[PDB]
């Protein structure tokens, strides 16, 4: 059996750590919900 | 039970002691997580239980209590913040500027930040704090590295 706890509000937190890259990728979802690299 | 509205931990006692599978958001009385995270399963709040409403596995969304209430969506431009909730961690706001997913049928927000498979349900949020969808279901590439899509569902 699964169960919920809460672990925060939503909110915009300004000053935040700022990472990550924005890379632009070929991709096919299938009828399962699964994403694969298209080439 | 738990009613709040908020970013929530999805535990199970299954498994050894207890073990975070998936993230969800809390908002108007619906729960919304991704579908892989509960595979449709019944949840429970403490002494209260939630039944799924609204599912679909090719969206990998659900929806527990009622309808998908999450609508806002990416502009294409801004940059977002990932409210990544870690299995044993605490909740952590992360900026990135998404990229883009291309498919068949229209392009898709991507948010490149790698997190344990347990952190899949964490809520992706705008200037304004709207949730524009869902981190958690997405790809690996040729680095090994986790692209995920911003995963948003349809309102009524
Ligand atoms: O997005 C995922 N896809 C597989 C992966 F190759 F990308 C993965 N969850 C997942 C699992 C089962 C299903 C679906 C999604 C949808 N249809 C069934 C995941 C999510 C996060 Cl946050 C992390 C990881 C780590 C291992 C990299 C994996």
Redesign the pocket.
Same mark, same amino acid.
């Given at each position: 059996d699964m169960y919920i706890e809460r672990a925060g509000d939503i909110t915009w937190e300004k000053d935040a750590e700022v990472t990550g890259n924005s890379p632009r990728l070929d991709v096919a979802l299938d009828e399962?919900?699964?994403?694969s690299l298209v080439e | 039970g738990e009613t709040t509205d908020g970013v929530y931990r999805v535990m199970t006692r299954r498994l050894l002691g207890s073990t975070q599978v998936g993230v969800g958001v809390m908002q108007e009385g619906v729960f919304h997580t991704?579908?892989?995270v509960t595979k449709g399963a019944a949840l429970r709040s403490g002494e209260g239980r939630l039944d799924p409403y609204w599912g679909d =596995?090719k969206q990998?969304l659900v929806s527990y209590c009622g309808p998908w209430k999450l609508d806002a969506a990416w502009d294409g431009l801004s940059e977002v913040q990932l409210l990544a909730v870690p299995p044993g961690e605490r909740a952590k706001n992360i900026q990135t500027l998404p990229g883009i997913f291309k498919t068949k049928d229209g392009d898709i927000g991507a948010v490149a930040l790698?997190?344990?498979?347990?952190?899949?349900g964490?809520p992706i949020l705008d200037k304004c704090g709207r949730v524009i969808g869902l981190?958690?279901?997405? =790809? =690996?590439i040729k680095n090994g590295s986790?692209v995920?899509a911003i995963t948003q569902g349809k309102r009524e």
């Open positions: 399962s919900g699964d994403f | 991704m579908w892989h =596995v990998d790698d997190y344990p498979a347990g952190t899949s964490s981190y958690g279901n997405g =790809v =690996v986790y995920s």
